[PDB]
Design a protein around this motif. Structure first.
Motif, PDB file in Angstrom:
ATOM      1  N   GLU A  29      31.970  16.937  -2.182  1.00  0.00           N
ATOM      2  CA  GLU A  29      31.208  16.080  -1.478  1.00  0.00           C
ATOM      3  C   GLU A  29      29.900  15.909  -1.237  1.00  0.00           C
ATOM      4  O   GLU A  29      29.086  17.015  -0.667  1.00  0.00           O
ATOM      5  N   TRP A  30      29.053  14.852  -1.790  1.00  0.00           N
ATOM      6  CA  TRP A  30      27.575  14.985  -1.634  1.00  0.00           C
ATOM      7  C   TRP A  30      27.062  14.687  -0.179  1.00  0.00           C
ATOM      8  O   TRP A  30      27.546  14.033   0.624  1.00  0.00           O
ATOM      9  N   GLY A  31      25.909  15.310  -0.028  1.00  0.00           N
ATOM     10  CA  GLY A  31      24.950  15.255   1.241  1.00  0.00           C
ATOM     11  C   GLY A  31      24.066  13.924   1.198  1.00  0.00           C
ATOM     12  O   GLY A  31      24.093  13.056   0.036  1.00  0.00           O
ATOM     13  N   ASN A  32      22.888  13.924   1.920  1.00  0.00           N
ATOM     14  CA  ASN A  32      22.164  12.943   2.014  1.00  0.00           C
ATOM     15  C   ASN A  32      20.962  13.407   1.163  1.00  0.00           C
ATOM     16  O   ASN A  32      20.233  14.194   1.664  1.00  0.00           O
ATOM     17  N   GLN A  33      20.620  12.994   0.053  1.00  0.00           N
ATOM     18  CA  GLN A  33      19.498  13.471  -0.604  1.00  0.00           C
ATOM     19  C   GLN A  33      18.241  13.254   0.359  1.00  0.00           C
ATOM     20  O   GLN A  33      17.245  14.118  -0.017  1.00  0.00           O
ATOM     21  N   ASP A  34      18.123  12.192   0.964  1.00  0.00           N
ATOM     22  CA  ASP A  34      17.203  11.447   2.016  1.00  0.00           C
ATOM     23  C   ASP A  34      16.710  12.648   2.885  1.00  0.00           C
ATOM     24  O   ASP A  34      15.594  12.685   3.542  1.00  0.00           O
ATOM     25  N   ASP A  35      17.567  13.852   3.429  1.00  0.00           N
ATOM     26  CA  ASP A  35      17.422  14.822   4.177  1.00  0.00           C
ATOM     27  C   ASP A  35      16.440  15.889   3.577  1.00  0.00           C
ATOM     28  O   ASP A  35      16.009  16.823   4.213  1.00  0.00           O
ATOM     29  N   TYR A  36      16.122  15.786   2.291  1.00  0.00           N
ATOM     30  CA  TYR A  36      15.136  16.595   1.569  1.00  0.00           C
ATOM     31  C   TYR A  36      14.046  16.134   0.938  1.00  0.00           C
ATOM     32  O   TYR A  36      14.108  15.127   0.119  1.00  0.00           O
ATOM     33  N   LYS A  46      17.352  25.033 -19.186  1.00  0.00           N
ATOM     34  CA  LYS A  46      17.641  24.131 -20.285  1.00  0.00           C
ATOM     35  C   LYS A  46      18.327  22.869 -19.589  1.00  0.00           C
ATOM     36  O   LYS A  46      17.694  21.723 -20.114  1.00  0.00           O
ATOM     37  N   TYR A  47      19.263  22.610 -18.758  1.00  0.00           N
ATOM     38  CA  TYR A  47      19.514  21.404 -18.257  1.00  0.00           C
ATOM     39  C   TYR A  47      19.427  21.343 -16.686  1.00  0.00           C
ATOM     40  O   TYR A  47      20.361  20.970 -16.030  1.00  0.00           O
ATOM     41  N   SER A  48      18.388  22.185 -16.187  1.00  0.00           N
ATOM     42  CA  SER A  48      17.973  22.137 -14.796  1.00  0.00           C
ATOM     43  C   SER A  48      16.435  22.142 -14.573  1.00  0.00           C
ATOM     44  O   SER A  48      15.835  22.974 -15.020  1.00  0.00           O
ATOM     45  N   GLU A  49      16.127  21.538 -13.534  1.00  0.00           N
ATOM     46  CA  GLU A  49      14.825  21.384 -12.896  1.00  0.00           C
ATOM     47  C   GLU A  49      14.762  22.060 -11.622  1.00  0.00           C
ATOM     48  O   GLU A  49      15.580  21.433 -10.907  1.00  0.00           O
ATOM     49  N   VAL A  50      14.279  22.903 -11.105  1.00  0.00           N
ATOM     50  CA  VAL A  50      14.133  23.595 -10.105  1.00  0.00           C
ATOM     51  C   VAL A  50      12.822  23.133  -8.994  1.00  0.00           C
ATOM     52  O   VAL A  50      11.638  23.067  -9.780  1.00  0.00           O
ATOM     53  N   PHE A  51      13.012  22.961  -7.862  1.00  0.00           N
ATOM     54  CA  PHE A  51      11.948  22.404  -6.963  1.00  0.00           C
ATOM     55  C   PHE A  51      12.111  23.144  -5.482  1.00  0.00           C
ATOM     56  O   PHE A  51      13.202  23.550  -5.097  1.00  0.00           O
ATOM     57  N   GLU A  52      10.985  23.320  -4.986  1.00  0.00           N
ATOM     58  CA  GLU A  52      10.918  23.924  -3.683  1.00  0.00           C
ATOM     59  C   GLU A  52      11.095  22.191  -2.881  1.00  0.00           C
ATOM     60  O   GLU A  52      10.295  21.693  -3.042  1.00  0.00           O
ATOM     61  N   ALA A  53      11.524  22.508  -1.749  1.00  0.00           N
ATOM     62  CA  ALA A  53      11.767  21.515  -0.894  1.00  0.00           C
ATOM     63  C   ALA A  53      11.895  21.724   0.690  1.00  0.00           C
ATOM     64  O   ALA A  53      12.042  22.861   1.091  1.00  0.00           O
ATOM     65  N   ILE A  54      11.877  20.722   1.317  1.00  0.00           N
ATOM     66  CA  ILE A  54      11.867  20.827   2.998  1.00  0.00           C
ATOM     67  C   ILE A  54      13.070  20.147   3.493  1.00  0.00           C
ATOM     68  O   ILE A  54      13.290  18.921   3.227  1.00  0.00           O
ATOM     69  N   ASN A  55      13.890  20.756   4.245  1.00  0.00           N
ATOM     70  CA  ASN A  55      15.023  20.141   4.652  1.00  0.00           C
ATOM     71  C   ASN A  55      14.485  19.388   6.160  1.00  0.00           C
ATOM     72  O   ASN A  55      14.022  20.359   6.975  1.00  0.00           O
ATOM     73  N   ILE A  56      14.281  18.106   6.056  1.00  0.00           N
ATOM     74  CA  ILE A  56      13.735  17.305   7.180  1.00  0.00           C
ATOM     75  C   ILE A  56      14.211  17.533   8.424  1.00  0.00           C
ATOM     76  O   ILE A  56      13.707  17.380   9.477  1.00  0.00           O
ATOM     77  N   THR A  57      15.494  17.830   8.620  1.00  0.00           N
ATOM     78  CA  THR A  57      16.284  17.689   9.619  1.00  0.00           C
ATOM     79  C   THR A  57      16.099  19.043  10.251  1.00  0.00           C
ATOM     80  O   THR A  57      16.670  18.874  11.792  1.00  0.00           O
ATOM     81  N   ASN A  58      15.484  20.043  10.069  1.00  0.00           N
ATOM     82  CA  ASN A  58      15.269  21.330  10.583  1.00  0.00           C
ATOM     83  C   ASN A  58      13.961  21.962  10.049  1.00  0.00           C
ATOM     84  O   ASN A  58      13.570  22.959  10.441  1.00  0.00           O
ATOM     85  N   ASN A  59      13.135  21.151   9.081  1.00  0.00           N
ATOM     86  CA  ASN A  59      11.855  21.777   8.624  1.00  0.00           C
ATOM     87  C   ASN A  59      11.872  23.208   8.078  1.00  0.00           C
ATOM     88  O   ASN A  59      11.052  23.972   8.134  1.00  0.00           O
TER      89      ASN A  59
END
Length: 324
Positions: A29-36, A46-59
């Protein structure tokens, strides 16, 4: 070949329901990518890009690993294993699974770990620091092995350490698999330097003990300050590197015990080698990190016979950890 089974947690998956280990039947079950909100690129695999992000709903800071959807069944296996192990000691926490509304690319969202550099660590690390963090990895391995899971990619790149807070997390469960006794697994797992003899000789009926070999390789690199410890140039050479330390005599004893047919490619490269004493790797640069207890412990992990290696629980009881 002669069949083999794990000495510990042998039937943990057999006694569980199909839903726990049938990752192909698992409903994702997918979440809201818009929350990040993606902040910055941390790295690339190889088959993955890793990013630092912010969960907007809780900073809150998170890590988003965007997977190049090359194998869907493999993404399902990783998600299922991450969900089963969620909250286990020193296991990376899968916070969410998002699909971007437009791209529909799978993305795993994890707890943020403020990792301290390994090139910088192994120089400032004390004899005690090595023991403490080795105990922290054994906590993660004994937990996941008890949960019927083999990580199959134990290496320093998959161990995140927040040295300031003395926090350790075992990451990248993309190669992990459910242990079922008698099952024949794909040997094309782990990273070359950490590959157990079982993989290099094409012995498919391996178990949790594969992780204990890999752990031994990491220990050997830390105490002796030799990275990697077994520096193979390909998978065939990798066995020759191991054979240069544990001798060819014990290798033939191992292949005879399990009736393993050695690949013809080993004929002109294996040669004949003697078993080396662990004390020969002690030098001026590393002696402050070596002890008789450390050498006895290493000797008990780095063994050809996967059945003869210490399990994660036996390793936790070793005198090497009496100080932790």
């Amino acid at each position: 070949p002669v069949p083999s089974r794990a000495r510990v947690y042998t039937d943990v998956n057999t006694h569980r329901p199909s839903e726990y280990w049938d990752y192909e039947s698992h409903v994702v079950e997918w979440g809201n990518q818009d929350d990040y909100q993606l902040v910055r690129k941390l790295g690339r695999g190889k088959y993955s890009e890793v990013f630092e992000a912010i969960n907007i709903t809780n900073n809150e800071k998170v890590v988003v690993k965007i997977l190049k959807p090359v194998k869907k069944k493999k993404i399902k296996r990783e998600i299922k294993i991450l969900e089963n192990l969620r909250g286990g000691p020193n296991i990376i926490t899968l916070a969410d699974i998002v699909k971007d509304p437009v791209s529909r690319t799978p993305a795993l969202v994890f707890e943020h770990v403020n990792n301290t550099d390994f090139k910088q660590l192994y120089q400032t690390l004390t004899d005690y620091d090595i023991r403490f963090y080795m105990y922290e990895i054994l906590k993660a391995l004994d937990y996941c092995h008890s949960m019927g899971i083999m990580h199959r990619d134990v290496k320093p790149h998959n161990v995140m350490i927040d040295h300031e807070h003395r926090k350790l997390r075992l990451i990248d469960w993309g190669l992990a698999e459910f242990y079922h006794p008698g099952q024949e697994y794909n040997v094309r797992v782990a990273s070359r330097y950490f590959k157990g003899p079982e993989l290099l000789v094409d012995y498919q009926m391996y178990d949790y003990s594969l992780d204990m070999w890999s752990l031994g390789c990491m220990l050997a690199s830390m105490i002796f300050r030799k990275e990697p410890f077994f520096h193979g140039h390909d998978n065939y050479d990798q066995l020759v590197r191991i054979a240069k330390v544990l001798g060819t005599e014990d290798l033939y004893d191992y292949i005879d015990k399990y009736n393993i047919e050695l690949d013809p490619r080993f004929n002109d490269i294996l040669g004949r080698h003697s078993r080396k004493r662990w004390e020969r790797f002690v030098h001026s640069e590393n002696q402050h990190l070596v002890s008789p207890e450390a050498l006895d412990f290493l000797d008990k992990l780095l063994r050809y016979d996967h059945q003869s290696r210490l399990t994660a629980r036996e390793a936790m009881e070793h005198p090497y950890f009496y100080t932790v």
